[PDB]
Design an enzyme around this catalytic site. Structure first.
Site, PDB file in Angstrom:
ATOM      1  N   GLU B  16      37.565 -28.585   8.556  1.00 41.31           N
ATOM      2  CA  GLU B  16      39.005 -28.569   8.793  1.00 41.31           C
ATOM      3  C   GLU B  16      39.520 -27.227   9.302  1.00 41.31           C
ATOM      4  O   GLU B  16      38.801 -26.481   9.969  1.00 41.31           O
ATOM      5  CB  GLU B  16      39.756 -28.923   7.512  1.00 41.31           C
ATOM      6  CG  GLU B  16      39.650 -30.383   7.119  1.00 41.31           C
ATOM      7  CD  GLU B  16      40.338 -30.673   5.801  1.00 41.31           C
ATOM      8  OE1 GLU B  16      39.868 -30.149   4.764  1.00 41.31           O
ATOM      9  OE2 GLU B  16      41.345 -31.423   5.797  1.00 41.31           O
ATOM     10  N   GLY B  17      40.779 -26.932   8.988  1.00 42.21           N
ATOM     11  CA  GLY B  17      41.366 -25.674   9.415  1.00 42.21           C
ATOM     12  C   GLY B  17      42.819 -25.778   9.827  1.00 42.21           C
ATOM     13  O   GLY B  17      43.562 -26.633   9.334  1.00 42.21           O
ATOM     14  N   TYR B  19      43.736 -25.811  13.265  1.00 41.52           N
ATOM     15  CA  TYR B  19      43.659 -26.725  14.402  1.00 41.52           C
ATOM     16  C   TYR B  19      43.718 -28.182  13.962  1.00 41.52           C
ATOM     17  O   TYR B  19      44.404 -29.007  14.579  1.00 41.52           O
ATOM     18  CB  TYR B  19      42.359 -26.478  15.181  1.00 41.52           C
ATOM     19  CG  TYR B  19      41.167 -26.063  14.342  1.00 41.52           C
ATOM     20  CD1 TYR B  19      40.302 -27.016  13.805  1.00 41.52           C
ATOM     21  CD2 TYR B  19      40.924 -24.716  14.061  1.00 41.52           C
ATOM     22  CE1 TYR B  19      39.222 -26.642  13.003  1.00 41.52           C
ATOM     23  CE2 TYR B  19      39.847 -24.327  13.259  1.00 41.52           C
ATOM     24  CZ  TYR B  19      38.999 -25.298  12.731  1.00 41.52           C
ATOM     25  OH  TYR B  19      37.939 -24.927  11.928  1.00 41.52           O
ATOM     26  N   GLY B  20      42.998 -28.474  12.881  1.00 44.39           N
ATOM     27  CA  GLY B  20      42.929 -29.821  12.347  1.00 44.39           C
ATOM     28  C   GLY B  20      41.482 -30.248  12.152  1.00 44.39           C
ATOM     29  O   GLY B  20      40.552 -29.561  12.585  1.00 44.39           O
ATOM     30  N   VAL B  22      37.761 -32.233  12.163  1.00 47.99           N
ATOM     31  CA  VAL B  22      36.741 -32.511  13.164  1.00 47.99           C
ATOM     32  C   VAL B  22      35.668 -33.261  12.391  1.00 47.99           C
ATOM     33  O   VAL B  22      35.287 -32.827  11.302  1.00 47.99           O
ATOM     34  CB  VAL B  22      36.097 -31.218  13.720  1.00 47.99           C
ATOM     35  CG1 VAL B  22      34.981 -31.577  14.692  1.00 47.99           C
ATOM     36  CG2 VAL B  22      37.142 -30.355  14.406  1.00 47.99           C
ATOM     37  N   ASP B 132      35.139 -13.508  24.061  1.00 49.77           N
ATOM     38  CA  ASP B 132      35.202 -13.576  22.622  1.00 49.77           C
ATOM     39  C   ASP B 132      33.903 -14.041  21.982  1.00 49.77           C
ATOM     40  O   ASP B 132      33.890 -14.659  20.905  1.00 49.77           O
ATOM     41  CB  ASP B 132      36.379 -14.438  22.183  1.00 49.77           C
ATOM     42  CG  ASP B 132      36.658 -14.296  20.710  1.00 49.77           C
ATOM     43  OD1 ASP B 132      36.882 -13.154  20.265  1.00 49.77           O
ATOM     44  OD2 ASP B 132      36.630 -15.312  19.985  1.00 49.77           O
TER      45      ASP B 132
END
Lengths: 333, 332
Positions: B16-17, B19-20, B22, B132
């Site tokens: 999760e997180g 962002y949403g 996965v 990055d």
């Protein structure tokens, strides 16, 4: 909706869940005061971190009747598990948007609401602070009619970017680089005053282009050298000529049930040239507000150096830890 | 919830997180297992813009070392467009977590280090810089395939926020040359260094400290030719104002390390970005002849700046502007 905050605080009702976090009306068991508590988990969201930081620095500096009061921020213990910021500020019933959307307001209330909003702008600019995003929903109101500005997430200290909408953004700001002027705030107020009379946004553009078309559709398309004598931009001057050329519309003739003086003050704010645009001070003095004007009680502010928001001045990339420390430090003095 | 074509069978949640969520899913029609990300970026400006970059860079490339996105759900309305379903090629773990939980043979090191520079090469050849790179942006699957992702800070070559600068090149931090292909090689050298060390080589606690650590190993630059590529007076003063330590001999720091790897490490972790070795030169170099192959290594093809037109407009973006960018990219 967890709240690992002091015992003395007994939550009451959730006033709003935002993209920022949740805000709840709580009670101070001790004095029995009713405050507003914000829970903010912003560390994985860089943008919301700076916004919160800015807001915290500004709220805490001012001590003005028209700017929201932060009572205290909860201090964490370990910087190691610091993942929530709790802000105890004054509780506010509603905001100017909600009010307009449900009540018809007497010319007096309008005089008073715009008066208070200008009062705050005076102190902010006098302090070298530009809000940069004034809109009806930033103007909070109390049951007895106190208006209070908040949401300095876009503020700057003078001398890409995201916005929820450019409905109150000044044309010179969309067309050029002059995006950090006191004028732009006075433009928002023009708009706000317009919504107070019309009870609806005056320039609800649906996209960039449509915004300008809507704006010039009212104030008039700037053509001669004297109109664009504040638009040194070759591109901006081109783009303006890519829009039809309208005459300023007779606000007075079309809205005859509105106080003629409001209309004047409105016209002196909604002016394309940022340099001919009335200033908050000259605005408080305007006729339409004489009832409430009292120059011995329109605080001029105290200057705040740019270093207040030093981060706005370096290119160096900000890291997560950096952001957490800036807020942390802010909390511990 | 995962509002998506019933042609999929949700297996399990992978993470999760902000962002949403996965998670893994089976594509009933081919029995191929996939990952489906469920991003809800429209109330997070910065994330929507990151998502926009990811979708454009991934959909474009077709390299074995850059994550492959199979499809993206078609929203059937703008008004109710609040999520984005990306269906991409499932990956077990990431190099960060591999290093993080095991000793890897010098063989494994070269494998991953070869694959990595393999990708960087195509992107650099296509005028695309990742900007990055780090262990956790290097996803790895079963048969140890390394594929790069997370292009949220990428740019097209003719400020920002980062989780850390442990992999940022000294010149990018000091100067404003924050867009060279070189910064990616430096990052690379930190991955490499990390593969040997099994821990971050430059875990700085802050801006200055990071520079203090980097110069602590590579040597503080002090000479005109050192500061040749540093055009800023303010910047030069800065360097000249820090403790001035002479370079440390890698050999005596990575002793139980392949003498051919050190040499490569030294060629990547160099202050002067001009002297710094390139993604192509790194594949060639000795330590990597065992996998080198001047054939199986795409040199990409230049992409036009307009691929990222938005990085060239200084207007402010709105929520709708953002929804519209992603929307167009999905249907166009």
């Amino acid at each position: 909706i967890v709240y690992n905050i002091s015992s003395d605080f007994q939550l009451k009702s959730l006033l709003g869940e935002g993209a920022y976090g949740v805000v709840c009306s709580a009670t101070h068991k001790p004095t029995g005061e009713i405050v507003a508590i914000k829970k903010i988990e912003p560390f994985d969201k860089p943008l919301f971190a700076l916004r919160t930081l800015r807001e915290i620095k500004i709220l805490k500096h001012f001590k003005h009747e028209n700017i929201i009061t932060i009572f205290n921020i909860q201090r964490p213990d370990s910087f190691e598990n610091f993942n929530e910021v709790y802000i105890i500020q004054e509780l506010m019933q509603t905001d100017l948007h909600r009010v307009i959307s449900t009540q018809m307001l007497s010319d007096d209330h309008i005089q008073y609401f715009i008066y208070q909003t200008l009062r705050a702008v005076k102190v902010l600019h006098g302090s070298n602070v530009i809000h940069r995003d004034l809109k009806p929903s930033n103007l909070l109101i109390n049951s007895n009619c106190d208006l209070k500005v908040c949401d300095f997430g876009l503020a700057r200290i003078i001398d890409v970017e995201f916005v929820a909408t450019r409905w109150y953004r000044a044309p010179e700001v969309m067309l050029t680089s002059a995006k950090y002027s006191r004028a732009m705030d006075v433009w928002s107020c023009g708009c706000i005053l317009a919504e107070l009379f019309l009870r609806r946004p005056i320039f609800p553009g649906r996209d960039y282009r449509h915004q300008l078309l809507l704006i010039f559709g009212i104030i008039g398309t700037p053509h001669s050298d004297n109109d664009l004598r504040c638009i040194e931009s070759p591109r901006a001057r081109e783009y303006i000529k890519s829009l039809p050329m309208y005459p300023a519309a007779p606000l007075e003739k079309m809205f005859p049930r509105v106080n003629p003086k409001g209309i004047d003050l409105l016209q002196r704010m909604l002016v394309f040239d940022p340099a001919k645009r009335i200033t908050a001070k000259e605005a408080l003095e305007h006729p339409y507000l004489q009832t409430y004007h009292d120059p011995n009680d329109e605080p001029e502010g105290e200057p705040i150096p740019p270093s207040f928001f030093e981060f706005d001045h370096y290119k160096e990339a900000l890291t997560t830890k950096d952001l957490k420390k800036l807020i942390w430090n802010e909390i511990f003095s």
